[PDB]
Amino acid sequence: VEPVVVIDGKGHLVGRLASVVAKQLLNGQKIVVVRAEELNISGEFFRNKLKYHDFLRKATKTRGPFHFRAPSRIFYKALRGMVSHKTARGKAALERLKVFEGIPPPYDKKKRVVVPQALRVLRLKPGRKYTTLGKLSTSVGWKYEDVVAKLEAKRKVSSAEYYAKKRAFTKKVASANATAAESDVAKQLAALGY
Amino acid sequence: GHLGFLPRKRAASIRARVKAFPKDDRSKPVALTSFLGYKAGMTTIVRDLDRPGSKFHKREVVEAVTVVDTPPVVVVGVVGYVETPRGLRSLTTVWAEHLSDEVKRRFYKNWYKSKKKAFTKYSAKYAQDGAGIERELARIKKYASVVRVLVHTQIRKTPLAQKKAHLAEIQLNGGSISEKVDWAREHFEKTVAVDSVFEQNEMIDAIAVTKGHGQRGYHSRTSINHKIYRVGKGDDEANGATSFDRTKKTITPMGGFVHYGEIKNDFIMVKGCIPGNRKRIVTLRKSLYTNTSRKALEEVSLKWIDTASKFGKGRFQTPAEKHAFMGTLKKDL
RNA sequence: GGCAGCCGCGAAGCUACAUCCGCUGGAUUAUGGCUGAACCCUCUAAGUCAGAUCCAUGCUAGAACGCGGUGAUUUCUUUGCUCCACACAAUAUAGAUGGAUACGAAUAAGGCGUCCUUGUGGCGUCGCUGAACCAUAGCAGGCUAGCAACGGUGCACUUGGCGGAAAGGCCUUGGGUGCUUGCUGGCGAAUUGCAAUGUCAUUUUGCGUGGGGAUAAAUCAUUUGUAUACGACUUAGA
RNA sequence: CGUGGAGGUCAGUGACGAAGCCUAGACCGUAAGGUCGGGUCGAACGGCCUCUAGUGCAGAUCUUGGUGGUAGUAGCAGCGAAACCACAGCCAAGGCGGGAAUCAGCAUACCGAAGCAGAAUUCGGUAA
RNA sequence: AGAACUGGCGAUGCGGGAUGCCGAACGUAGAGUUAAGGUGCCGGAAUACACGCUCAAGACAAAAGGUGUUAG
RNA sequence: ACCAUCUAGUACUGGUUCCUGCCGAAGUUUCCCUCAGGAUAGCAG
């Protein structure tokens, strides 16, 4: 297993993703979450928004409830309740977790991962309403969504050129393999499985 | 009591921290988004009310106006900022090669005891072909989004025993941040006048620390919708050179400004009073946007200006008034 | 008037019956419509326009258990401080024991190679798991011989570009120097006795040399008066 | 099991150190406890078979004596207590219970309807 | 609001139900299977399979209505 | 009002001291006009 695993929040579900991340953390696995602003939650926007606004006013009285606005912090709070926090084991587990909006460096130049069982599209029935989380964060007080999108747009650029270069390299490698075919070594490898 | 203006804990410095700027106009020519100065006493001014439908419409009306002791703003550097998901961040700071003694004093409390090793080796880096101090401009151009000029006030011109300089950042109105940094660099060590930014009838806002009653008072406050009535130039003479009262005198009250504020530099007249008392540094801003109301758009003239001293109740306007009625004054003549 | 005050003028402060000012943008709802089924109709089921509650602009404080940049880094604690090269110890790991092995977008479709009369296009085809890809052979990895290429790669340099979101990394030209298991040979492996993780990673700190770099700042004092219940704050001075 | 005393025994131990005291050193008995080594100690004690009783303490607003916070606080730059003291306390609710130190206090309008011409009025919803 | 009665405490541990009825009634230990109760995390256990339901619930109100959804 | 004795009086609070094993309930009835008392009915040796 990789020393650190980066999980793409795009098209994912907050609940299942948080549960699996917490379970892995308790097992002693380092995990990082990126593109958290694109995470999704089941149900329509109104239901999710009300469930969060009511939380902000449930009182402990500022010592307890905090009107935390960052969507990454909201996800951390969601995962916080799934871990045995306020203890050495639970607190140490949370130390192996980081959440960043978008994909800041150096995670950009590294292969991200997705959880097949935490995909919003995979587990959510088609045709049913869902919440993009970004709108909820913007409505509840978050104001960095515009800047997040603006600096993520540059992320798609440059990365596209890198993908094009890798595509050309793979084209050359495939051509070399195709012309390399029919060789004695290749024939022996094919016979012996490989 | 106001809920917004609580708690009443005192401000941490005499200078009021500005934390808002008039957006960023990408089409306007390069200009300063705010101005810095010092607050003097207060005076009285009368003008014609061109406001239509007013009870005193088309009639002379007296209005209370304060005077801000404005020293020339000399540029010492510029600061660039880049947008980030963690909020605005200052990526790099640069200075105008040379720094005056007043600016260096800002970093020192025991300046006399200290060996005076203020900005010096930094100037040595500038004392060459440039290299790093020139590549900083390119770095700012490449990534910066909003650029704030760094300037200080000519404290030694102000009649203040404290010769320590006061400096603050000012955003640049003009877009094309390349032009922002180019203009800032060209204006290094240059002197900027009030006319280069503000203008007559402009609805500026004032921010400063409130008076301390000796905890009530001594807290930062922002006052908006204040109209300038006349750009003042105290460096010259005959500041009262209005269209009326052709007996030119000086805005300085008899015997000087009460308590403090003997004007010896540029000044500005602003409608109403300003938070804080004299000796307090006050920053001026264009008030985000200009209201279209007549009270904010109409232009006003000026006439009578009170010059009697306030070291008591006030009576004599000029020293030449003392004659005729007093007869003989052997003690003097 | 030395002692104890009184009639006119008036501050110095206490301190109001004195004066000015007190802002513009979004998403909604109740509600009014559009398209359009459920079954002619329908503001609703898929969406949408107008439109007060929530957030923005602004103001106030600033995590004293948040963050970025910047003025300078003891000339003798016997290089005192700092960054480096080598060099011996302590210190421990929230826990290596080959490789975080980089597009985007949809999930009632997207790639890959090609064509081009360049498009939401045509053709062949891939998924149905990474159950893979890159590497992996040598005393835990040595010496040396021969063949084919000057390819692969460990490492000291050098020309240049990109990366400001937490850029602190990505490389690129040219040789230099080892290996090359791509192929064919000659050397030593033993005794740890039938195994005892059989010790190979760095996190921090301490002491011993040489290769450079710079040599300052704060408190009290003195005092200030914008401040001032007392702290505190604001200053001037080799 | 153990403490005070007594009958018989160990021809028992002990100034070459017994009683008592401490032990973050050990052993045994699951228990009342016993044993050993070490630091002080300076004059008598221990096991065994029996007899005997003023024989085992955490309480009793217990008795006698000693000792802490309070506290260098009121107090008289001084001189030095008392009261009180199992220990608690920052709140969300039910089983009657989610951080240094000192200085300063104890409502208006927005929609639809009325034979609502206008003015003006009433009603159903939003909302305090 | 008294009441004639039959199982259970008082003297009752332990597992489960966040905490106050179910299981099971007790020497000190090693090994294996279970009761109640559970198998997304806190929480040791299958984000197990199969048939439909539901858009706001879900771990005294059922007297009545819905152009809410699916069957005879 | 105080001082010493009869008086250490007149039945409701508080406390009731070392250890281990075994057995081990009851909370109700009987007989007198009850709460005061006992014969016992039952449980436990």
- What is the CATH classification number for the domain harbouring B201? 2.40.30.10
Q: Which helix (H) or strand (E) holds A178?
A: helix A145-180
Alpha-carbon gap, residue B203 to B289, rounded angstroms: 8
How many Cβ atoms sit within 10 Å of the Cβ of residue B206?
Answer: 25
Residues 73-112, chain B, touching A (beta carbon < 8 A)? 83-85, 87
Contact in structure between B41 and B253 (CB atoms under 8 Å): yes
Contact in structure between B28 and B280 (CB atoms under 8 Å): no
Same domain assignment for residues B84 and B36? no
- Asked whether strand E has any atom less than 7 Å from the CB of A91, the reply is no
Q: What are phi and psi of B188, to 5 degrees?
A: -55, 130
Same domain assignment for residues B197 and B327? yes
What are the Cα distances from residue B174, in Å, to A43, B76, B81, B141, B182? 46, 19, 15, 14, 11
Indicate the pairing of strand B203-209 with strand B220-232.
antiparallel
Omega before B275 within 30 of 0, i.e. cis: no
How many Cβ atoms sit within 10 Å of the Cβ of residue A115?
Answer: 19
Alpha-carbon gap, residue B225 to A106, rounded angstroms: 48
Alpha-carbon gap, residue B238 to B234, rounded angstroms: 8
CA-based nearest residue to B270, from B327, B190, B183, B205: B205
Same domain assignment for residues B78 and B29? no
Q: Look-up: residue for tokens 């050179």? A: B241
Resolution (A): 3.9
Alpha-carbon gap, residue A36 to A189, rounded angstroms: 44
Same domain assignment for residues B83 and B171? yes
Q: Please report the DSSP string for B266-292 in residue order.
A: -EEEEEB--SS-TT-EEEEE--SS---
Same domain assignment for residues B39 and B169? no
Q: Which of residues 84 to 123 on A have a Cβ less than 7 angstroms from any strand D atom?
A: 85-86
Contact in structure between A131 and A41 (CB atoms under 8 Å): yes
Alpha-carbon gap, residue B32 to B170, rounded angstroms: 7
Contact in structure between B137 and B177 (CB atoms under 8 Å): no
Residue B118 lies in a domain: yes
How many Cβ atoms sit within 10 Å of the Cβ of residue B247?
Answer: 8
Residue B100 lies in a domain: yes
CATH number where B108 lies: 3.30.1430.10
Handedness of CA B31, B34, B39, B43 (dihedral sign): positive
- Asked whether strand E has any atom less than 7 Å from the CB of A89, the reply is no
Question: Which nucleotide's C1' is closest to B226 (Cα)?
Answer: C21
Indicate the pairing of strand A41-42 with strand A30-34.
unpaired
Contact in structure between B35 and B284 (CB atoms under 8 Å): yes
Per the CB < 8 Å rule, is B85 touching A150? no
Same domain assignment for residues B46 and B86? no
Contacts of B87 in chain A (CB under 8 A): 144
Same domain assignment for residues B130 and B183? yes
Helices (H), chain B: 101-105, 121-126, 132-143, 177-186, 294-297
Contacts of B83 in chain A (CB under 8 A): 147, 150-151
Contact in structure between B20 and B258 (CB atoms under 8 Å): no
What single-letter amino acid sits at A135?
K
Calculate helix-pair angle for A14-27, A71-80, nearest 10 degrees: 60
Alpha-carbon gap, residue B159 to B88, rounded angstroms: 37
Indicate the pairing of strand A130-131 with strand A41-42.
antiparallel
Question: Which nucleotide's C1' is closest to A51 (Cα)?
Answer: E56
Contact in structure between B87 and B61 (CB atoms under 8 Å): no
Alpha-carbon gap, residue B118 to B115, rounded angstroms: 9
Q: Look-up: residue for tokens 């934390």? A: B19
Alpha-carbon gap, residue B155 to B148, rounded angstroms: 21
What are the Cα distances from residue B287, in Å, to A13, A184, B228, B284? 45, 82, 12, 9
Q: Which helix (H) or strand (E) holds A163?
A: helix A145-180
Q: What was the experiment behind these coordinates?
A: cryo-EM
What are the Cα distances from residue A10, in Å, to A74, A114, B189? 16, 9, 51
Residues A184, A189, A190, CA angle at the centre, nearest 5°? 100
CA-based nearest residue to A5, from A89, A106, A114, A155: A114
User: Whole-number Å distance, CA B110 to C1' C236?
Assistant: 10
Domains of chain A listed by start with CATH number: 1-144 (3.90.1180.10), 145-194 (1.20.5.4280)
The neighbouring-strand residues paired with A33 are A7, A99
Same domain assignment for residues B168 and B83? yes
Residue B130 lies in a domain: yes
Handedness of CA A151, A155, A160, A161 (dihedral sign): positive
Calculate helix-pair angle for B177-186, B132-143, nearest 10 degrees: 150
Q: Which residues contact B333 (CB under 8 A, 6 or more apart)?
A: none
Q: How many domains does chain B contain in total?
A: 2
Residue B241 lies in a domain: yes
Q: Please report the DSSP string for A82-100 in residue order.
A: TS--SSHHHHHHHTTEEEE
Q: Which helix (H) or strand (E) holds B34?
A: strand B34-48
Contact in structure between B184 and B33 (CB atoms under 8 Å): no
Same domain assignment for residues B67 and B197? yes
Both tokens assigned to A125? 């029935």
What single-letter amino acid sits at B60?
E
Residue B317 lies in a domain: yes
Alpha-carbon gap, residue A31 to B97, rounded angstroms: 48
Same domain assignment for residues B144 and B101? yes
Same domain assignment for residues B327 and B232? yes
CA B177 to mean position of chain CA atoms: 25
Range of the domain at B96: 72-192
Residue B126 lies in a domain: yes
Alpha-carbon gap, residue B181 to B62, rounded angstroms: 44
Q: What are phi and psi of B246, to 5 degrees?
A: -75, 60
Alpha-carbon gap, residue B80 to B92, rounded angstroms: 6
Which bases on strand D have an atom closer than 7 Å to a protein beta carbon?
90-92, 98-99
